Amino acid sequence: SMDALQLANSAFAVDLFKQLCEKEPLGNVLFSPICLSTSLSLAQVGAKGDTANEIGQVLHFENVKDVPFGFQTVTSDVNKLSSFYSLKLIKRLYVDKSLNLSTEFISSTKRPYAKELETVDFKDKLEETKGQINNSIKDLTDGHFENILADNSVNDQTKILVVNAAYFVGKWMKKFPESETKECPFRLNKTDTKPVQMMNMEATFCMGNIDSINCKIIELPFQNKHLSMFILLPKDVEDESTGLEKIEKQLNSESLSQWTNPSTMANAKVKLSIPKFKVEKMIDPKACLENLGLKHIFSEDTSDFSGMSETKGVALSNVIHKVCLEITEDGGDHKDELNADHPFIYIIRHNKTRNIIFFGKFCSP
């Protein structure tokens, strides 16, 4: 089934995660790979030749058939889910009015990327535009993203702007009892330590542990199993350089899929300890994307956007990606242990389609 777009989406997610890892080796990386894949695939429809092909290869759409309908499906699922959860995955692609878009592009786009594209006047009324875009995203995002543009230098030469705003205030299927949360040392590495609010329970979870990778993997479902967190916890505490080397050599698309597949896992009564955490991160994916092989998209000289416009000098001028994840005790009502008191990679996925929606690493409180 050619919702093998999932595999494409997670390959690209790993790729870009590795890049972000390289750029913040000690930072809490968090980003929403699905928003970026969605936005770039929309850009792709407007591209031709090498520009279009580059997007295809980087996003791994090689052997996916109807890409647009695939995203049409994932977006709808997610937008629905946004009526149960405190979840927003807002993706906008802003084009300047001075690039009269083709009808064929607009009709090709209405349904698969509904509301995700809109035309704006960056050129002349830039400050009004910027004010409008900020407020629109502030509202679209229920007040969390105050001023999304405000350190990204969006200028009046902006031709195409991609903004991704995403957030999630997790509600677990199995709540952590508030009274059992207590302050504990988080091991940053073999020697160093920093305080965390460790949440604690004992309940039944699909869990696995790979001997070779020396990793413990747990699935922590959110309310009604629409989304699941997968935590990848090394069994032993390690220096950053070591754990960073493992991310370079161990982790890859195929591997992430395999260690994270709940059929690899068994049902276990786990003594669970998870840090209570709130992470907010903004990235400029441009540099990282170029490292994966995306050049033409950003240059106004070499880019081809005949599919969407015939104004010369059109390029992806700017990409803003801000993500905020809040995790608390809040939830509904053989043995193993899982104590996440040291750095772990985590993914949050959409269980129905299996797409990764949030991808991160918790490195320190």
Swiss-Prot record:
A GO term for molecular function: serine-type endopeptidase inhibitor activity
Subcellular location, record wording: Secreted, Extracellular space
Keyword field: Glycoprotein, Secreted
SMART domains: SERPIN
Main location: secreted
SUPFAM superfamilies for this protein: Serpins
Tissue spec: Normal mammary epithelial cells.
Domain of life of the organism encoding this protein: Eukaryota
PROSITE patterns per the UniProt record, alphabetical: SERPIN
A GO term from the CC aspect: extracellular space
GO biological process: extracellular matrix organization; morphogenesis of an epithelium; prostate gland morphogenesis; regulation of epithelial cell proliferation
CDD domains: serpinB5_maspin
Protein family per UniProt: Belongs to the serpin family. Ov-serpin subfamily.
Function statement: Tumor suppressor. It blocks the growth, invasion, and metastatic properties of mammary tumors. As it does not undergo the S (stressed) to R (relaxed) conformational transition characteristic of active serpins, it exhibits no serine protease inhibitory activity.
Assembly description: Interacts with IRF6.
UniProt protein name: Serpin B5
Protein's organism: Homo sapiens (Human)
